[PDB]
Design a binder for this molecule. Structure first.
Ligand SMILES: NC(=O)c1ccc[n+]([C@@H]2O[C@H](COP(=O)([O-])OP(=O)(O)OC[C@H]3O[C@@H](n4cnc5c(N)ncnc54)[C@H](O)[C@@H]3O)[C@@H](O)[C@H]2O)c1
Ligand SMILES: NC(=O)c1ccc[n+]([C@@H]2O[C@H](COP(=O)([O-])OP(=O)(O)OC[C@H]3O[C@@H](n4cnc5c(N)ncnc54)[C@H](O)[C@@H]3O)[C@@H](O)[C@H]2O)c1
Ligand SMILES: NC(=O)c1ccc[n+]([C@@H]2O[C@H](COP(=O)([O-])OP(=O)(O)OC[C@H]3O[C@@H](n4cnc5c(N)ncnc54)[C@H](O)[C@@H]3O)[C@@H](O)[C@H]2O)c1
Ligand SMILES: COC(=O)CCC(=O)OC
Ligand SMILES: COC(=O)CCC(=O)OC
Ligand SMILES: COC(=O)CCC(=O)OC
Lengths: 333, 333, 333, 333
């Protein structure tokens, strides 16, 4: 495969490493995290409150992190410019620290000998891609790219199927979203976004999300036709998209289901899922889909105005898409 | 003031009793609950995990419950027909067990001498009223009435203001709702509502709600123009309405804020609130409003298609509305 | 392998069924639960908020619950005297409803053709057993037995090792315990035990437990030398034992560690575990041990006065021990 | 009343301010925090997820934080030696950042013109005081003091009563402790305390505490006779001390209750509380006691070996003790 270095060994960094090592679709050869040393990396990778103990062996050997017998070079650079990616043989770097989302900042890795960078977040100026939706618009000239956000990877496949078949005239989305590392256990400082500092385990917290507008970038005909917002709620993982949209062509709810179900069995297999079961959020913990349409939870007001519900494991589904994107890029070289 | 019996000393029964006692609009004179004996009522009224210790005295004396020096007759009847309301002097009865919501069942209280019954829940056939929206359409021939649901009591005053000023062509609603007594601590049997049995503290749980349709009964012009659904999430109190609606007349977001703020200061004062602060759900705990508009959390895609956010303490706001409705009804005797 | 019937398809009944299947030690041939119809059992067995989706197939077919292709007979009787266990071939019945814990009540299963009953909880009069501690005291005259509680199955193996090497003069135990089905989502009625009705998601809740005393029954020499209590805290699963005990023979803390480590690799392997990792409760979710010693978490005041810490998955470890006890009983036949 | 400056507007500094204003025992005249603008201070003081909205008026006016009409000078100094306490009239300074807990660091505030410094945390080298237990050991030569920790303030009053009357031969403590600002919302990096980084809302987490050893300095006769540890649990606030101790003189449990009750009504009034009710943790939210003994939750094994339970609001009880300690110091000047 392509040899991958991971910058930022957090929720996404470690679950991208889990998906890479377990799927075998790419090879992790290096990790950088100045806040997690090699022995700490062993513990943080082995144990996971949300996805359970890693099924396999992980150890420290001669200064390397050894996962299922295979060594991984470890870096401790706060400055992404000083990471010697080339010497470790890492061709692609996953930028998952949360603090290098612009091309200028994410371009640091190229200096170390990396050849392309995949920002595990929206970017102000890097080209953004959602597997199943616009990844074929990638081309080899793009050395710095973004895999958008979890919420965008949930909404864009759904919005693609609804728009392709019935036309979205306009839509508004809410995501009811699990807590993340940027939140606080008790009321604490968060100077730019005051509500995000309030106690994550106590509160429903409204928050902004660019995910709906960003869908207008991965689906250009939806530009200006979608926006939305978010609620953070006290669950540790798994989120859900609630898309209220008005349709061009009339659609009985059973045709929406039928069309969404066909897409989940066809080209969006593994990316867009479909279910009619009485599911709840924990039923999608460690599910690798980008988006699972929840037939029974949605509701139509009429044939042109509907509320559609789609679940996503915001940690693990997104991490698998990071791997899929990199594998697609490597196949295009 | 009217004298009141409370049937069902649960979350709503006890909080109706709080709001009545320390606001002097009505007088609780009797309570029936066959699963809470007198001494247990002292303890359950005294302490509240959500709203804090009762501020006042509560004791058991001569077989009655005495709150701030005022004795309350205590019954232990599983069947409402056997409650001697009249002999206790309860003129109105708050039906807050959750299992007598039809006119046939709630009417059992009139056999014990009660004059009128206020069901603390939507009713399949009893007329439904929301303070500030349609309570003046009540008339004195109605011996059995419903105070709708807490979600209807949050959505309807907002919908009234929006529809009065701009016309709601159509709307879809989501309520992100706190846990209630009908849910389960761990995955367990829940009759035919299978999702409602799943662990309340672990899950985001989609659920059905009539509230948006019931708005079409409370605001006739909106009949068939609103529906919606709910997500139960792990908080113990306080919920929020997310109304996505299409407007007939174009409205800038700042014009929406203007009319809502003005309504909150005029005829809907104390029922509909308005805020521009960076609030989260806990900021409405023990808030007696039916609906507080949250200016900053909402978002407009354009001048005719907007997402509006309104907070509600589903426990204490509704319970004050139950008192207000009975005081209003009493004022028309 | 012995054919087993399950009375009460709850947390324990369902995880005993998972454990039976995952381990092959017994064969579930029938299940009784009047509150969970056949199609509903498919769903409750398949989806699990705590332990994840069932790994295998489960379907309803021709009136039977079919798990991994094996059909299981389904009863729907509230009264155990009416379950036709013998018609289904069930020799042992797991009594896991929580309402038939005496020998009189559990004995109803013998009227239906069951040969033995294993009560999934402490019993007032049925003999109680803890795998690895006193299960060899079981003999074939015992047609009704108790597998004690999960807290006893955690405390007793540890207490046995400690007492056999240094002698426990006296000890007091706290278990910090996850929430269970008997608790309430919000402050509600709990007539017998007032604290157990307070909202489980909000509260540290003191609770009684006879578990440490029950160790005096399974380890006779410790009779009257152990008692304890519990705190119910807001987690969905996994609990921890905190044993403060005085020792007759002096022991350095690393003598304690080494003796427990040896026991966990010898005759108590699979029952008592040992770790020095910086674990937290979620690291034992879905762990089959009765009791895992946490070396780093305990602390000694001196060589004779120590506080020892041991983790237990209260759902899954206990369920595996029920299966283990039935399999041991079968080999004695 | 003494005029007080507050360094750090985190939970402690804010709740100390609430306590000071609500009790009128001292006057806040100045606040320093370089990470929080004045308008953010208004918001953070006004809204509190745990203790509810401030009951009073909070606004910014001419660069000052005006609480109930009284203005308060605001500083934004990185370095405490640069804060100008003197010109603000601040005589005592609460050092509530957590990083200036030594006498050398805390003394910096003396360079700004403050007369005394009260560290709101344990100190390596400043004398630690527990109100009600050893505050008689304060003298006017002490310019820098510590109020110890909230757990120390729970345990020491209870230990004193029990050791004064029966003699603690040796004791082992566990505190079951609510979530704090040092924890993480999801599994994240946590320096050398690996367990503290695991998801706070999901886990029961073992932790260290110096509180038991500190009580052996607050009460010198107990030096080397107490040690302990903590479990971090998923609640927002309120903790509980679990003290298992051996008594020199034998005591019936009703003897223990009687002397504790007697101390709570006498010299430890308002510091040590006493209850026999079926309390749970939320019943002590915003309670100003250091320690409330829970008669029904404890258990005696015999007359020389007991487990004693005492509740503390780890946020608000401690904050009120900071104010009382300052008022006590001011009365000795
Ligand atoms: N639901 C999700 O969790 C999710 C989904 C998609 C995208 N993202 C995005 O992924 C990015 C990281 O998310 P996360 O959830 O994994 O957060 P995280 O905090 O758990 O992990 C970020 C990691 O980066 C490390 N780090 C910090 N600074 C670093 C630096 N200079 N150099 C190297 N490592 C550094 C940190 O120690 C940490 O381990 C963010 O942009 C996030 O918005 C999160
Ligand atoms: N946020 C809310 O909780 C909320 C808000 C508005 C309306 N409601 C509705 O109010 C009703 C009660 O809800 P709740 O939250 O207070 O639930 P709850 O379980 O806390 O209270 C129900 C009470 O009814 C008692 N009871 C049961 N059967 C009885 C009988 N035959 N006779 C007398 N008493 C009996 C029960 O002991 C219990 O105390 C429901 O219909 C509910 O949907 C709830
Ligand atoms: N951590 C644990 O949950 C745990 C551990 C060890 C032991 N136990 C004990 O096991 C027993 C059950 O515990 P649980 O957590 O599984 O409770 P649960 O509520 O999850 O399951 C109880 C099941 O019994 C069913 N039931 C009720 N009445 C019945 C009847 N007449 N006939 C047949 N079925 C009936 C119920 O529908 C329910 O599904 C209790 O005694 C408990 O204390 C529980
Ligand atoms: C990063 O993962 C997410 O959940 C996306 C939310 C968001 O960033 O809105 C665009
Ligand atoms: C009682 O208040 C609510 O729970 C609102 C939900 C509802 O009942 O739907 C109409
Ligand atoms: C399974 O539940 C428990 O562990 C505690 C119950 C108890 O009292 O112990 C005998």
């Amino acid at each position: 495969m392509v040899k991958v270095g991971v910058n930022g060994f957090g929720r996404i960094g470690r679950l991208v490493t889990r998906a890479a090592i377990c799927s075998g679709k790419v090879e992790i050869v290096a990790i950088n995290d100045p806040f997690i040393d090699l022995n700490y990396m062993v513990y943080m990778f082995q144990y996971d409150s949300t996805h359970g103990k890693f099924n396999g062996t992980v150890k420290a050997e001669n200064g390397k992190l050894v996962i299922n017998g295979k060594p991984i070079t470890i870096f401790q650079e706060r400055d992404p410019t000083n990471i010697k990616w080339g010497e470790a043989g890492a061709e692609y770097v996953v930028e998952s620290t949360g603090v290098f989302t612009t091309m200028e900042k994410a371009g640091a890795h190229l200096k170390g000998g990396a050849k392309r960078v995949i920002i595990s977040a929206p970017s102000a100026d890097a080209p953004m891609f959602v597997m199943g939706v616009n990844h074929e618009k990638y081309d080899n000239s793009l050395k710095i790219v973004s895999n958008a956000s979890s919420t965008t990877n949930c909404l864009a496949p759904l919005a693609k199927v609804i728009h392709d078949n019935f036309g979205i005239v306009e839509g508004l989305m809410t995501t009811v979203h699990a807590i993340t590392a940027t939140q606080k256990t008790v009321d604490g400082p968060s100077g730019k976004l005051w509500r995000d500092g309030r106690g994550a385990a106590q509160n429903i917290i409204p928050a902004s999300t660019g995910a709906a507008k960003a869908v207008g970038k991965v689906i250009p005909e939806l530009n200006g036709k979608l926006t939305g917002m978010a609620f953070r709620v006290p669950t540790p993982n798994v989120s859900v998209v609630d898309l209220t949209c008005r349709l061009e062509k009339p659609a009985k709810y059973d045709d929406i289901k039928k069309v969404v179900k066909q897409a989940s069995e066809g080209p969006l297999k593994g990316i867009l899922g479909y279910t009619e079961d009485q599911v709840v959020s924990c039923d999608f913990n460690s599910n690798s889909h980008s988006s699972t349409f929840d037939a029974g939870a949605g509701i139509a007001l009429n044939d042109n105005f509907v509320k559609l519900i789609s679940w996503y494991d915001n940690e693990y589904g997104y991490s698998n898409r990071v791997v899929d994107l990199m594998a697609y890029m490597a196949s295009k070289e």
